Amino acid sequence: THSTNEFRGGLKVMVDGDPCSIIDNEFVKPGKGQAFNRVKFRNLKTGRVLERTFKSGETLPAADVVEVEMQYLYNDGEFWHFMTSENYEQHAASKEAVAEAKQWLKEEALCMVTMWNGVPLSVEPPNFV
């Protein structure tokens, strides 16, 4: 759904089956060679960075992913719980899913939540509280 010209920071695309967000994109022409794009991704699943090139033709599928704010409520040790701070819709996350999130949880803190396919991936607090 998306093509190399459109590439840019924050754009969310599907890369090797993984949800990703573009950190930075650089167009380059080698003298003597084919032109192409040097792209860096944040892989929202593994949190890891990765870097890849594309010739001018190539595309990637759009990924539906968005960051919503919710307040952390509680944890059962398995899932962690939130609700949108907009209409108060409740959502829960997998243990791993929250990831590094765990040690920063203050009940009633309002966080930002990375969400793919109506299901949550990553959790980013208000920096420090």
Side-chain angles (χ1 to χ4, degrees):
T1 24
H2 289 297
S3 64
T4 67
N5 37 318
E6 321 177 30
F7 293 12
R8 61 177 184 273
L11 194 61
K12 313 264 144 53
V13 290
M14 289 298 313
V15 172
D16 219 15
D18 272 19
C20 293
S21 173
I22 297 187
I23 302 164
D24 183 31
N25 151 94
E26 282 299 318
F27 304 90
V28 157
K29 190 161 165 319
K32 205 150 178 31
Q34 233 194 302
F36 67 82
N37 212 334
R38 225 171 66 248
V39 191
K40 279 186 182 183
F41 304 98
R42 180 67 64 185
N43 173 326
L44 307 174
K45 179 179 301 180
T46 88
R48 311 301 264 171
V49 173
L50 54 111
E51 164 155 1
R52 217 124 102 51
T53 79
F54 302 85
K55 301 174 198 187
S56 294
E58 301 195 47
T59 86
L60 298 177
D64 41 350
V65 175
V66 47
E67 283 208 324
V68 195
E69 185 190 351
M70 20 236 269
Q71 293 178 326
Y72 166 56
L73 310 196
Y74 67 98
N75 68 91
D76 49 341
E78 215 182 9
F79 302 78
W80 276 240
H81 293 277
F82 306 74
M83 64 173 168
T84 86
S85 56
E86 290 67 347
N87 214 239
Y88 281 174
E89 298 182 344
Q90 298 174 334
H91 300 275
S94 86
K95 188 170 188 290
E96 55 177 21
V98 0
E100 181 234 335
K102 310 201 160 189
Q103 303 76 1
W104 65 48
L105 67 94
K106 82 173 176 68
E107 312 196 332
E108 210 131 10
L110 40 69
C111 310
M112 287 294 318
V113 171
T114 312
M115 285 233 17
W116 179 41
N117 289 337
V119 186
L121 304 210
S122 168
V123 178
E124 64 290 9
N127 235 65
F128 293 67
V129 153

